[PDB]
Design a protein around this ligand. Structure first.
Ligand SMILES: [K+]
Ligand SMILES: [K+]
Ligand SMILES: [K+]
Lengths: 207, 201, 208, 206
C-alpha cells in the first residue's frame, strides 16, 4: 500500500470516478468512452485482490468487506436503471488518508458537483409538466424549445446563484413544487456555504 | 432509566405544539397530546429533584404553575398554549444540537410566515393581491398562500431576495425592516454555531 | 466643585447620550427632509467643575479650565450654539471622549440603525437634488403618482437596509449615474460593515 | 532600499497602480512615456542597488531571475497591453509593505477594487464583442450611451455580483454572459470570503 504505482493508479481511478459522477447524472436526466472506466473499475477489484490492526498483512475480504456494493455498481444490462452507477462514489469513500492543497481542488470539485446534481434535479422538476422553462424560453430569443446547452447552462446558473445567495431575478420559482425545492436548496445552500466557505478560509489560513 | 426517554418523548411533543399552534391560530389529534400534556403535571408532582446540599408540592407550586395551567385548559385565547415551550427550556449531542438549531430556524420562519399572512390579510379595501397574479388563480388555496409565505420568509431570512415577493405597502416595508434586522442577527447568531462546532465533529 | 464618577453625572450622562442620540436621529432628519440645548450647553460648566494624566481628580477648581482647554473645548463652542444647525452633529463628538465609560450589543444595533439613517437622508438628498430616477419612480409602486414625508423616509430606510444587508429586493434599483455611484459606495461600506459589525456580534454571542 | 527608495518605492507603487488601472481601461473601451521613464530608471537604480544572501552578507542580478519582464514592459514600442507585466513589481517588494496593517487594509480594499475593475473590462469586452448593452440603453434614457455610463454601470454590475446583492436591473441573459457570471460568482465565493475574513482579522488586531 506504499508503492510508486499504487499512488498514481489510485489518482487515476479518482479522475475516472469524477468522470462517472459528472457524466451519469447529466446523461440520465437531460437526454436519457465509458467502457474504459468500466474496465478500470473492474480492474480495481482485482487490484485489491493483489494488494490487520496490530501489524501488517485478501479475497474473501471483499466477499465480506465491499463486493456486492461494487457488483451492483458495475454490472451490464431500462436506461434509467443506470443510476446505480453512482455507487462508484464509494471509491472515494475509504482512502481519505491518501487523498488529503488537494483539499481545495476537492472542495471546488464537490461544490461544482452539488450544483450539477441540483441543476439536473431542477431540470427534471421543470420538465415534469407558469414554470421556469416556459420562461427561460421567452427570456432568450427561443419562444414556444431551447437547445440542450441553453437549458443546462441556465439550470446550472440558477442553481449556482440561489446557492451562492445572489438571486439575479431573471429566474424565479413560480409553482409550489418549485418553491418547495427552492426552500430546500436555500437550506442546503445555507448549510454548505456556512460550512465549506469557512472551511476554505481556515485552509488558506493555515497555509 | 426511563426519565430521559420520557423527556425526549415530551420534547417531540412540545415541538409538535409549537409547530401546529400558531398555524392553527393564524391560517385556520388535539386531545391525544393534550391528555399527555395535562398528565405532565401529575408527572411533575411525582417527579423527584435534588437540593443544593440536601441531595415536591411547593417545588412545582413555585417552579412554574401560574403559567402552566393557564395554557393547560381545554377563539384566539388558545394561543397561550405556546407557554409549553418553556418546558424544553428547563430540561436541556452534536447530531441533537444541530437538529435543534435547524428546528429553531424553521420555527422562526414559520412564525414570521404567519405574521406576514396576518399583515397581508389586515388590508382588503399589498402582496396578497400581488400574488394571485403570478400563479394562474387571479383575484388562492391555503396551500399556496402558506407556501409563498414561507418562501418569502426564507428568502429574506437567508438574504437571497428572489424578486417575486416585494413589500409594497408601508406596513409591509416596516415588517421587512424588522425581519432583515433579526435575520441579519439570525444568520450572525444561528450560523455562528453551524460554522463553529464542526471542529468537534 | 463637582465630580465625574458621581451617581449623579452617571445618570445625567446616560440622559445626555439619549439626547445626543435624539439629535443624531433628529438633526439630519430635520434639514434633509428647547431644553434640547440647555443640557448640552450646561455641560460646559458641568465638566468645568476631571482626572489628570498621572494624577487624581484634582480639587481647587481653578486648575480645571486650562485642562479643559487642553482636552476638548474648541469645536464644542460651535456645538453649544441657513443649515447651520448641521453643526449640532458635533454634539456627537461628546460621546467620542465618553465612549470609554459604557462597557454592548445595544450600541452596535443603534449605530447600524443610525448609519442606515444617515444614508437614507443622503439618498433622499440625491433623489431630490436632481429636478427616470428612484423617487420619481416610487410613485408608481404605491398609488401616489406624479408621496408623503413618512412614505419617503420609510422607503429610503427600506432601501438602505436592503443594500446594507445584501438582499436587494428589486423595487429599489439605482437607475441614474449619481445613484449608481452612491450604490457603489454603499455596497463597499456594506461589505465593510456586515463583515466587521457582525463578526463583532458573533464574538459577543460567543462570550456569553 | 535607500530613503530615496524608502519614498520612491511607494512612488513606483503609485505608478504601477496607475498602470494597472489605466492599461486595461485604455485597451478595453477605446503621460505614458512619462511613466515609461520612471519604469526605465528603476532598473538602473536596481543595478547600482544591493542584493543579499542567506549565509553571506548583503549587474548580472537583472540577468539572474527577473530579466525579460521588466524589459518587455519598459518599451514604448491591444498590443500595448504588454505593459500590464509591470504589475509583477509589487510582488517583488511585499516583504516590506505588510509590516503596516494600516497599509495592508488599504492594500486589500485596492485589491477588491482592482479585481472589480478588470472584471468590468472583461464584462465590457464580452458585451461589446457582439445582450446587456441593449438592456442598459433602455433604463437610462438613451436607446439604440456615453462611455461614462457604459463603464460605471459595468463596474456597478460587477460590484453587485461580487458582493452578492443582485439589484436585478441588469442581468445576464445570453449564454456567454451566463457562463461569465458563473465564473464571477465562483471567484466571488473565493475572494469575498477569504479577503473579508482577512478584513475581520486585521480590523480585529485593534
Ligand atoms: K447575499
Ligand atoms: K435580488
Ligand atoms: K441578493
Amino acid at each position: 500500500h506504499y508503492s510508486p504505482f499504487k499512488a498514481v493508479w489510485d489518482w487515476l481511478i479518482l479522475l475516472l470516478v469524477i468522470y462517472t459522477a459528472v457524466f451519469t447524472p447529466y446523461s440520465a436526466a437531460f437526454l436519457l468512452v465509458d467502457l474504459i472506466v468500466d474496465i478500470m473499475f473492474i480492474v480495481d477489484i482485482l487490484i485489491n485482490f493483489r494488494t490487520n490492526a496490530n501489524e501488517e498483512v485478501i479475497a474473501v475480504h471483499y466477499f465480506k468487506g465491499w463486493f456486492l456494493i461494487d457488483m451492483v455498481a458495475a454490472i451490464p444490462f431500462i436506461g434509467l436503471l443506470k443510476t446505480a452507477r453512482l455507487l462508484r462514489l464509494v471509491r472515494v469513500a475509504r482512502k481519505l488518508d491518501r487523498y488529503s492543497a488537494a483539499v481545495l481542488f476537492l472542495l471546488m470539485c464537490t461544490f461544482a458537483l452539488i450544483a450539477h446534481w441540483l441543476a439536473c434535479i431542477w431540470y427534471a422538476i421543470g420538465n415534469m409538466e407558469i414554470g421556469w422553462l416556459h420562461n427561460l424560453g421567452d427570456q432568450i430569443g427561443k419562444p414556444y424549445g431551447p437547445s440542450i446547452k441553453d437549458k443546462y447552462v441556465t439550470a446550472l446558473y440558477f442553481t449556482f446563484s440561489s446557492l451562492t445567495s445572489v438571486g439575479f431575478g431573471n429566474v424565479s420559482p413560480n409553482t409550489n413544487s418549485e418553491k418547495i425545492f427552492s426552500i430546500c436548496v436555500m437550506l442546503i445552500g445555507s448549510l454548505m456555504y456556512a460550512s465549506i466557505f469557512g472551511n476554505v478560509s481556515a485552509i488558506i489560513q493555515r497555509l
